[PDB]
């Protein structure tokens, strides 16, 4: 409700098309499409994107707010892109990257290889630091979550894969 | 690479240079002629119907004679199917040698075990039944020796069927 009443400013270089319920956004990174729920109406609103809940839907306000948030994220992605940083805390944790596959070794007897969805670029400024660039927040988040699931942040040393803007808690045995 | 039908001849132990003689069953695999090709368009699935051996003129029924003439193959004592590996089909009248099994190292042997007489209630249900002469496939058998110029195959262990019994050897799909 409150979040919905907030048109999102679309910067230059981003093209937005509203084909019925479908929203197609284009920018520097590439094409993006997203079928919007029918419970909210979206108009072009040049330089903005106004959302209006459809009459007859009790969930209209939350749907409109979520759609506005998703469109804002897509606009921010296409215009500049989304970047995520992941650190590998621990001795011997390598983050070799080649092609469209990220290879990791977090104490397993076998390497853990994760496939990179199209449109996602992986870079290694440092061997223990891995940076993902992607136009869509969902894809980069999913790949980062898949990488993190291989080795959970160990809650005794805070090892494994961690996000740059995430706080990792750790603890030690009380007395024994 | 693809299944071949052969005939059991005997089983022995092949003495290795290191004194590790292995039980080997001997299969004579004559060049099996691909009588027909079953494709998706006509037969609904990929496979080849093949034969081998020779049939007596009296033993060959005229329908079978025409079938072989269309296939362009010598009348073999039996016909069998072989499902392809979705790689490619074979041509009518093609004879398949044993070189395909020369580089497999793992095969499965399907055959009919030696027949046994009346299996009473105690032997079957512990009504009566019977044992033997049943087509079963023993899996995970590694070929020991292959001789293409002699059409000789030695396979580890034991296989169903007595001397002269027809059997099939297929790639060891199961591991």
């Amino acid at each position: 409700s409150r979040v919905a009443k907030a048109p999102v400013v679309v910067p230059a270089g981003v093209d937005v098309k509203i084909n019925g319920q479908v929203i197609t956004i284009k920018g520097k990174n590439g094409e993006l499409t997203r079928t919007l729920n029918d419970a909210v109406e979206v108009k072009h609103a040049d330089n903005t994107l106004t959302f209006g809940p459809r009459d007859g839907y009790a969930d209209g306000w939350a749907q409109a707010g979520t759609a506005r948030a998703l469109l804002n994220s897509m606009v921010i992605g296409v215009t500049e892109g989304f970047t995520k940083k992941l650190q590998l805390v621990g001795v011997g944790y390598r983050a070799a990257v080649k092609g469209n596959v990220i290879n990791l070794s977090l104490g397993f007897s076998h390497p853990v290889d994760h496939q990179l969805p199209a449109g996602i670029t992986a870079e290694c400024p440092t061997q223990t630091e891995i940076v993902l660039k992607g136009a869509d927040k969902q894809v980069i988040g999913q790949v980062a979550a898949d990488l993190r699931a291989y080795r959970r942040p160990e809650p005794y040393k805070g090892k494994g894969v961690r996000y740059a803007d995430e706080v990792v808690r750790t603890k030690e045995a009380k007395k024994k | 690479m693809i299944g071949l039908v052969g005939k059991k001849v005997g089983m022995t132990r092949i003495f290795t240079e290191d004194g590790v003689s292995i039980p080997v069953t001997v299969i004579e695999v004559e060049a099996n002629r691909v009588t027909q090709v079953k494709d998706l368009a006509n037969d609904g699935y990929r496979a080849i119907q093949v034969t081998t051996g020779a049939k007596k003129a009296n033993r060959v029924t005229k329908p079978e004679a025409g079938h072989f003439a269309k296939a362009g193959v010598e009348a073999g004592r039996g016909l069998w199917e072989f499902r392809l590996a979705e790689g490619e089909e074979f041509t009518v009248g093609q004879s398949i040698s044993v070189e395909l099994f020369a580089d497999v190292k793992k095969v499965d042997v399907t055959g009919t075990s030696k027949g046994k007489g009346f299996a009473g209630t105690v032997k079957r249900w512990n009504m009566a039944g019977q044992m033997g002469n049943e087509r079963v496939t023993v899996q995970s058998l590694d070929v020991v020796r292959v001789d293409a110029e002699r059409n000789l195959l030695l396979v580890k262990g034991a296989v169903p069927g007595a001397t002269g019994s027809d059997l099939i050897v297929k790639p060891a799909v199961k591991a």
Binding site: - | D18, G19, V20
Partner: protein, 122 residues
């Protein structure tokens, strides 16, 4: 080989003369035991200060089998009787430093590296 209530000979200076099997280990609900298998035996007759007293319960291993055992080359080495040497769960090193009769070449196991030294007769 061994079965239920088997009669085993003795091939060590521990003083045992007649050893009788009681239980079979090396597999749940197992039937028999082999030469390279651990068996459960007790003693029936002991010297005045034999290391084993009647009713003892301790492990053992068969060194010679009346039934005979096979080899990869087809050898079926067999002996006139079943000979067994007692072993302990702790301090596996048997007390007997001398073994009567020859032994086969299957004693190359991890724990049987100290027995191959004994038995000078092959």
């Amino acid at each position: 080989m061994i079965q239920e209530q088997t009669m085993l000979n003795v091939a060590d200076n521990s003083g045992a003369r007649r050893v009788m099997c009681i239980k079979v280990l090396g597999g749940s609900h197992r039937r028999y035991a082999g030469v390279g298998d651990i068996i459960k035996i007790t003693i029936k007759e002991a010297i005045p200060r034999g290391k084993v007293k009647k009713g003892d319960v301790l492990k053992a291993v068969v060194v010679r089998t009346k039934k005979g055992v096979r080899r990869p080359d087809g050898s079926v080495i067999r002996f006139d009787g079943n000979a067994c040497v007692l072993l302990n769960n702790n301090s596996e090193q048997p007390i007997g430093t001398r073994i009567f009769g020859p032994v086969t070449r299957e004693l190359r196991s991890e724990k049987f590296m100290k027995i191959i030294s004994l038995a000078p007769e092959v």
